[PDB]
Ligand binder design. Structure first.
Ligand SMILES: [Fe+3]
Lengths: 190, 211
């Protein structure tokens, strides 16, 4: 039939079939298990960087993000050239990869399904205010929205504004969620 | 490549399937999902069989309907598999034998790619640039929404990388270029039909020209 899906084996079967490579000695012992790094090491670390920036005018992070991140030892795959973008009382930053899913893995963690969605990839570049609003984040009309499309090797993190009511908190500050680092959420005080 | 993957600005999609800070569950929602990335790194770092850019391009080369119906991690299973076949490391026969059924792959490339341009300009922060009004059938890291548009330099990278339009096809002539954070007004990109302020695109030097 017209426009129909190609017949395909279950994806689990196709993925494990590809893992053909192992039987040819092309995959080192413990290799994919080692990478499965993804679950434990790559982690929204980004919160630690934000809390440090908030309490240490380190806030180095905005001029040489790579150097700042390297101080914590958090450079890594898909996170080798880092730029932090600062929210201000007149500016809200948001990150996407419209072309695929590019994300600062080591400090944000692997991207979530929603960030990889065609909905986010298509819409946030053109209607970021509506997208954020739908997601539960109301950006005040007096604030400019700036969308960073991750199209090359720069990997971004948002430095969100520090909310009122957190004065004097300990680096407690690390209310900085994955969504805050991507730029779709604002840090919330309980 | 003006493929269906170039989604920025496409209209008609519904709501993003997420509300802020909602539980997104585990990193991997199935036992195979770590494989595409793991096996990509085997190919890139251990075998030296292809670049990360080739992985992006082979996914772009999925038949368009196939791309549109395939979940993210599955696209990379298909892409990495396709590269292993194209590079002569695996055969489709053995993949389908091991899978116990059909394992359709991405379509062959219709472009040999292009070299890094010899003639480019070193731009400075604050300079106005235009995105070269060029059409590239192979891999390119310029989303169509900025083609021929004018914006201002916010950043020039302090590192340089191979030109994707070359290394994405495994060519020997990708050289190295810095990239530029180019800031466009939302209205430069989408006229009156946007609710945004600005959009910053990270563009290779060879995609740009003085305004
Ligand atoms: Fe991406």
């Amino acid at each position: 039939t017209e426009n129909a899906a190609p017949a395909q084996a279950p994806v689990s079967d196709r993925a494990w079939a590809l893992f053909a490579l192992d039987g040819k000695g092309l995959v080192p012992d413990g290799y994919v298990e080692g990478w499965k790094t993804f679950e434990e090491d790559f982690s929204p670390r980004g919160a630690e960087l934000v809390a440090r920036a908030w309490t240490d005018p380190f806030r180095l992070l905005l001029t040489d993000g790579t150097a700042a991140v390297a101080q914590y030892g958090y450079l890594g795959p898909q996170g080798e050239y880092i730029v932090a973008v600062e929210d201000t009382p007149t500016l809200k930053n948001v990150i996407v990869c419209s072309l695929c899913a590019c994300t600062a893995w080591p400090i944000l963690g692997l991207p979530p399904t929603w960030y990889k969605s065609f909905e986010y990839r298509a819409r946030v570049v053109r209607e970021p205010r509506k997208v954020l609003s739908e997601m539960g984040t109301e950006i005040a009309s007096d604030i400019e929205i700036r969308v960073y499309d991750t199209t090359a090797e720069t990997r971004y993190m948002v430095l969100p504004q520090r909310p009122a009511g957190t004065e004097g908190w300990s680096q407690q500050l690390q209310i900085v969620t994955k969504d805050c680092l991507i730029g779709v959420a604002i840090p919330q005080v309980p | 490549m003006d493929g269906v993957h170039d989604l920025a600005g496409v209209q008609g999609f519904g709501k993003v399937p997420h509300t802020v800070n909602a539980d997104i569950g585990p990193t991997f929602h199935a036992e195979w999902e770590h494989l595409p990335y793991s096996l990509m790194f085997a190919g890139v770092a251990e075998l030296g069989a292809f670049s990360v850019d080739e992985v992006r391009y082979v996914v772009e080369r999925m038949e368009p309907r196939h791309y549109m119906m395939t979940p993210y991690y599955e696209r990379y299973v298909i892409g990495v598999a396709t590269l292993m076949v194209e590079k002569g490391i695996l055969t489709q026969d053995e993949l389908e034998s091991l899978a116990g059924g059909p394992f359709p792959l991405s379509r062959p490339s219709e472009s040999e790619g292009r070299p890094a341009p010899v003639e480019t300009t070193t731009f400075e922060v604050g300079q106005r640039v235009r995105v070269r009004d060029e059409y590239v059938p192979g891999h390119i890291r310029m989303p169509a929404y900025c083609r021929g548009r004018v914006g201002t330099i916010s950043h020039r990278t302090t590192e340089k990388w191979p030109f994707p339009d070359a290394i994405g096809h495994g060519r020997n002539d990708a050289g190295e270029e810095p990239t530029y954070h180019v800031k466009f007004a939302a209205e430069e990109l989408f006229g009156s039909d946007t609710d945004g302020g600005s959009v910053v695109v990270d563009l290779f030097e060879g995609y740009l020209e003085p305004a």
